[PDB]
């Protein structure tokens, strides 16, 4: 028997009306689940990753996935003190999540990162939406987070394209395309 | 003989109009008064909290007035660079701040946390006015503070009535109300 | 609805007559009252001491007010486990401080480092007799507690006084007195 | 092929007649082998121990013992420091321990707290008496010594007193009685 | 052969429009350049600083370098990942600097001081301006790290006053102007 | 009033058969006593050990009894985790134990040194046939645990017997047996 | 004058047979010497690697060998321990080692890496062996030890396995075959 | 109001006649100016360093400036002990610097590698002369300092060089020159 | 020109009548005299030991002097706090030290730990009065002061007497007397 | 019974003549005496300066002796590594110190500052004769040891000086000579 | 196919011509081999010394090779760092080294301290000619480098002599030679 159902809002202890709780915390949801796909992605692609670049890929990839995990905890946290009820099972955070995961399989280094770039840039999207959303509502909580989370999901977009960028110490003597 | 006059706002370093400043620092200093009432509070029932949870509240409470501590210290220090002067004196405290400290005595543990959850809760709703007071005359710094405030204010306020929330593991083999 | 009230002093569980704790605790309760009292007071001159001495006297309040802070940790706590009920209202806390806290507005530098060496050795005073009264009483766990305080306590007062003395490296190139 | 037997004092390095190093190490190894007891008691207890409260009373336990254990290490090195020969077997250790084991097996929560507060409490009893004897006859480092130990071992009864407490937050939606 | 060419903004990761990448990487350009220039005078203050405050002065200017350094490095890596040009060179950074550089030599404490109080302000007025571009271009990300940065930035120009504020611990033995 | 007997293994939450708990148990509780007695024994060692090698000695024993408390605290734990009953009295530690302590009084160094070796002997033997049956029953979790034991245990033997070894830099300038 | 020879197995204190400790030592300062040999090749691999890889194949090589030092002390150790008799003498190690050092000179990036992979190859192979042994022979601790060490070896292997896979970001702007 | 003329040297405490500490203070704003437009530089790199190699390039130029602004300070500190005036304007730094800045805009990884070499080469060859002159002149202080960032500096040289050499893991599936 | 004449005692910020804080202080003196002279001894033979028990000697000489130093440092503070001044010159350190220093040369290492632990004792001896007499003139502070460094002096003492017993590991291979 | 007497020089490990070793310890007893005078008088200093500036100078003086400290450390252990034998009585480092004490009393700040730069300064002297003297008899290890010193001690001195400089914030409202 | 031949010198990025690296890096190649004999040596008496002094030893063979392999660490670089190819493999080691290891088998601790004592001494004389040499040739960097190991290399031959020391605190009962 349940404490609270799924897609309900319950009752906050910071005086906040639900016509501003309700959407927050859809929303909330929409990130959540899209960072937990982020976050296996990441992991994935830390798991797997290989080639020449292979080591600072390696890394990179980790931090990312440990960073994002930071997201998601304070989200999970802020969702549910809002009085929403936190997604986590894999159907319902695959009918969330605001981008496609990669499939399964292991992609190409410069594959796998377009598509964690992509993914950031889905992410974006929503944040910036959703933080606007908040201004509006007057929940500047859920506004300020939104923003502190869109900083680090920005930096690790441009650290990403950096990675893409068609420069190598390498061109100083092999043959380019 | 004094170089600052209580009630007053001074020359500040941060190219601010008295426009802003006063209510600015006017509003700080209820809010610092606020805080130093909920850091007592918290404190005491750090000192008297007792049964079957003592534990887990115990360290709590520890928690909350040093978080508290904190944002006192920030306000302070903003409060008098702005040019006011920031309250300090018992019976001006008293006067100042937005809720009413609980009696002296023990209560119950469900009564202290009602009794803290209602006082973050007098505090949120002074914020919230405060910072967008800041908004409106362009104080970002200020508002910026008492945002980075709120989030913690609010987490505690969680905090707190996740503790008042009727269930438990006992109710397994212990008869309800 | 009351648990303990205020003034009055029950079971301990550390085998101590109610005859020792009454006047322990009640001791206790005008050093703790004293030491917020001087914590408010160390805490406004950290956010409001100016001048060519600034800095320093700045990060001096800041150590000795958290140093206070701890023995109000370890004041309240014990307070508490002898039986007894904490001071926690502006009012009480007004009434049982041994000291008259610094009025509102900013002071000198060196009147306020005047006021705190005074309210220090008000407390100075009154930790001795507590102290003899506690060994007298047959409580060794208050006297040594109060001994522990009572060397820092001194030391501040050192402290203080040393920042008091009339020698400056400016007095090789400005006129004195 | 001994060389000092349990029982006698030796020779010590610290200028303290062996008219105060005997009575003081007997005490000693009252004291030492009644910590041996309630540390094993403890560690007992962070073993088994159940319920809602578990959690709680498992790293409550932990650290008591842990803090146990300290005062065992402090009071043997001085007890042989002064001569002394510390109590080390099973059934030496059960003959000096100043208060009964719990039995084996395994107690309910409420059950094995009183235990640990009777135990501790028998411990102050001693402690108390040993002081004051080193205190009579001029031994000021066991003196100090024992008060250290003294007021962490009054802070722990303290503790096991509240969690005895009959309050809860659970009582507002179980039935009382 | 060049990547990038100053003054131009290339492709960014993160979805916006050139019509706020431009001004905003323009703004982080004059924003970076003026913190050099009070890196490097806080630093050289830190150099050659001397007289009765030395010590304090010494650590403060020292403190105050390297959280501009901070301050610098963010924006350096938001401005290349927005697609701008980060300066470097002696003479643009001369160029583009909010407030003109303290001259060779050595002035005095207090001369060095209210050159450095003058440096923030100048920065302070570009921050709030750049920030409320931002907010109305839609970069929340560029705001809330601008507003990130006032908040210290304004902390600096507090301490800075209080150094200059005229009152002295020696004003109790010394004959005022 | 109990909850369960010693002598008796009860339930399990994982997954083992009471065939395979019960004489795993029964080997934890004998493994458990005899680290109890090893520890009392390391410890004395440490609180008594004198002569030339003293220093090297003292850390030693320290840091032997601080490791042998650590597999104490694993078994205790898993042995209630299988649903076992963990020994804690003098009485049935003594019973348990896999060795016969030191006599109390104080022994020479070598004899000491010597006592713990044979001491870890009779551990290292009981620890390889209560792994070789652990690994026959099916318990895994346990076979592990011991082997992880096992070779922190058999490194204290290599230490102890190279305290023990007839080598010295001193039979350069002293005479031999 | 001698006291052990290299060849022999002597005395431990682990109740292990000599037949059991003469080839599990044989073994080991096969594993030992080997080690050695990896180490050295690491160590000059970060000495002399160059390339666009450089940094990540310099520091991959320094975390490599540092962790292969580890290996080599908890061997010689046990080596030891177990009565046998480590070696140490440069032509020896030579003999002993299950694969042929690198030539003098330096290679490229892509052979060094080859080189490494092949070295903790044959590596792999010992350990399983003297692993199969040593459970064979009844000796858990020297099993479970290499066994530790076989899951770093196993993974070293992996990371010199991904530097040399056909895969780059450069793959996108060179032309490849 | 000046104090101290830039170009002019001063009284020093440390007993050094003028003859000294004139050349010695010019070389060291000579190396102060030419070591702040590489840290300048270093940083530019750190900030718009792009493709394959991206991270590894990315944390070396952060490193590398680090430990750059470490030689600042110390080389500003000690110019300064000697009675000097340190360069700290855009203006003349940019004349006193011994190498040419990479002028404005991105580079690729190799070119601003291969700037960074040529400045740091520039820089070894001043700090050469400028420590003869030292050991020459009699001011070891300044000799055994030079020293210590000599050697840093050529490893940094040597760092430089590697990421420049002609191999990568890349050549054994992608076309060469 | 003086402020404080050597012999006198001045005001004090404590409250103590000077009938109190001139033997006080002239005590303080003497034990700072006495302590230095340790020190510098202590830190002798940790510069000259050596033999086969070297390196533990070593340590526990250099350990021995810093817990020297840190009680040189509480004395000094507040023998200045007391309005005492603190002996410093070597002509009246040597007048009042109350132990004569070990002669220059080295001396065996049995030899300086017994000098180190008659110096030890001598000043046991000077404390235990010390602190009897500020316990009747009520100067409860200096009494606890001292206690706390009892203690740790005593703990020296057992540790310098326990290098001095006639025990070693050698007797099982060597000659006795 | 002696072993090494003052004043000779006798056998070292590390291959220098003893016509080097002799006059390179002397020398070091005499920067090892006169180390030892100024960290006395740097203690004493720390324990007894007062005025606007305490704060400031009394942690200055404190980080002085323990650098000062740090030197006497290195210098004992290679004056004895060397052969030596270091000075340690009291009247001895009387006639060894290359400068008279400041007098016992107190005296003013701008006074103690001055003895303590006169005292580097003398001891600045010596260690470049020495230096010199090392270079000369071809020992690089004390060449170098003594450069390191004096580096730290050269920044001793500026830092003294600038203390002295007649310069203060307070002149901007203070009236000068 | 190699890269580089090991016996040439190549090309450095430090501005130093061929006739100074040549044999430069020649003598840091028979550095890096001595050390790296040392290194195995120092690891080698760690594994097998026993005795009464086993512990001290042990910590301090481990402290030593730890130390040496800093050593190595540095002059590896440096040799691939000025155009060197630094040696690895055993064979070229022993030809190399300056000193003959110790021959495999266990020998006595004293004849193990010895051992590394003469190895130190030839380590040190190479040390003071490669570094005259390269004074000579214009080489600070690698001058200096040299110092810093010839610092620390000298003293681990006092700490070795000092092991070696006719002394014990047992000469106080046992019979001399
Ligand atoms: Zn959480
Ligand atoms: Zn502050
Ligand atoms: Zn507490
Ligand atoms: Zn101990
Ligand atoms: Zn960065
Ligand atoms: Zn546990
Ligand atoms: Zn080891
Ligand atoms: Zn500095
Ligand atoms: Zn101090
Ligand atoms: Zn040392
Ligand atoms: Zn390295």
Chains 1, 2, 3, 4, 5, 6, 7, 8, 9, 10, 11 share one sequence.
């Not at 931090?63 to 997604?87: A, F, M, T």
């Amino acid at each position: 028997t349940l404490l609270r159902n799924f897609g309900n809002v319950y009752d906050n202890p910071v005086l906040l009306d639900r016509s501003v709780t309700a959407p927050v915390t859809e929303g909330f949801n929409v990130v959540l689940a899209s960072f937990q796909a982020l976050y296996l992605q990441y992991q994935k692609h830390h798991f797997v990753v290989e080639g020449s670049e292979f080591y600072s890929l390696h890394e990179f990839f980790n931090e990312s996935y440990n960073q994002v995990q930071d997201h998601i905890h304070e989200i999970g946290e802020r969702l549910d003190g809002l009085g929403g009820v936190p997604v986590a099972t894999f159907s319902k955070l695959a009918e969330l999540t605001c981008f496609e995961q990669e499939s399964e399989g292991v992609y190409s280094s410069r594959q796998m990162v377009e598509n964690d770039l992509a993914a950031e840039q889905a992410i974006i999207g929503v944040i910036r939406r959703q933080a606007a959303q908040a201004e509006s509502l007057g929940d500047r909580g859920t506004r300020y987070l939104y923003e502190k989370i869109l900083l680090k999901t920005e930096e690790r977009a441009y650290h990403l394209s950096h990675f893409l960028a068609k420069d190598s110490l390498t061109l100083g003597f092999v043959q380019a395309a």
